[PDB]
Symmetry: C3
Subunit: 119 residues, 3 copies
């Protein structure tokens, strides 16, 4: 019953990591995740970003991939859950053999929960 | 491309149109039960969809035993961009229930000025 | 990660870069046609996703259609895409 739906939902959800987990890593300084802001918009358009995030535009990821450490775990995020740069960056990383996840809720969710940002 | 159409068909089968939900709540068909799966704090503003049952996503699996199996459930979070709707949907479908996520979520519903439980008197 | 890579690959194939579309709207090539399927982008043809399954016969097959979802959702564009692709049309959703 609803086998196809369940299969897609399970694979789909496995792409993400909960913001609570990301939040605890920074508040405990456990060094578990490296947060990448993969939006392609200019800095003047982005305005703010998740606290401690690294600007790694999806369009340059391939070229700057050598900058990332293979032994770490990456979390990518875009404007919203509907934008596709999060998934695009995730695909590049997973395809490259990197351990990565997309931030559930994206930047929109983070801001909605009044979580830490920076300019 | 069969793979594209295949994905689109399955992905869309997860959602239900607001028009379908609206028509049902105005014709008294009683075919759908709306579940507000937003986090508890957000639901304090009492801005839920008309007739929606307050059921925080993190409590769904626990309170799913209070639901009528003959009804079709429609879940929604404050916005469609989150994964709370799909996570709730997975719980319901895995339990043998018929459910769908509301297209547009709460933001979209309000955006269309659709019926909310509490309104001007 | 095979299942993840597979899903992501098919999912992303549904979309087209705004850069490619924009350039075409200036390149004087005019091979892309933008459809606003809301039930604004200048030059876009207003065609509701609900009426698409009836007006789609007013489309030139030699053109690639790009569905634009103003609300930035993930279902409106897909509804329109499903209709267009099933009809044999080449189409993508504007990312
Ligand atoms: Br962007």
């Amino acid at each position: 019953m609803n086998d196809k739906k369940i299969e897609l939902l399970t694979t789909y959800l496995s792409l993400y990591i909960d913001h609570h987990t990301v939040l605890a890593d920074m508040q405990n300084a456990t060094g578990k995740y490296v947060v990448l802001d993969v939006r392609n918009a200019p800095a003047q358009v982005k305005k703010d970003q998740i606290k401690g995030a690294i600007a790694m535009p999806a369009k340059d990821l391939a070229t700057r991939i050598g900058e990332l450490d293979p032994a770490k775990t990456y979390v990518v995020y875009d404007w919203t859950g509907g934008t596709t740069l999060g998934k695009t960056a995730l695909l590049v990383l997973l395809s490259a053999g990197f351990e990565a996840y997309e931030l559930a809720g994206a930047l929109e969710g983070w801001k909605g929960m009044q979580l830490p940002l920076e300019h």
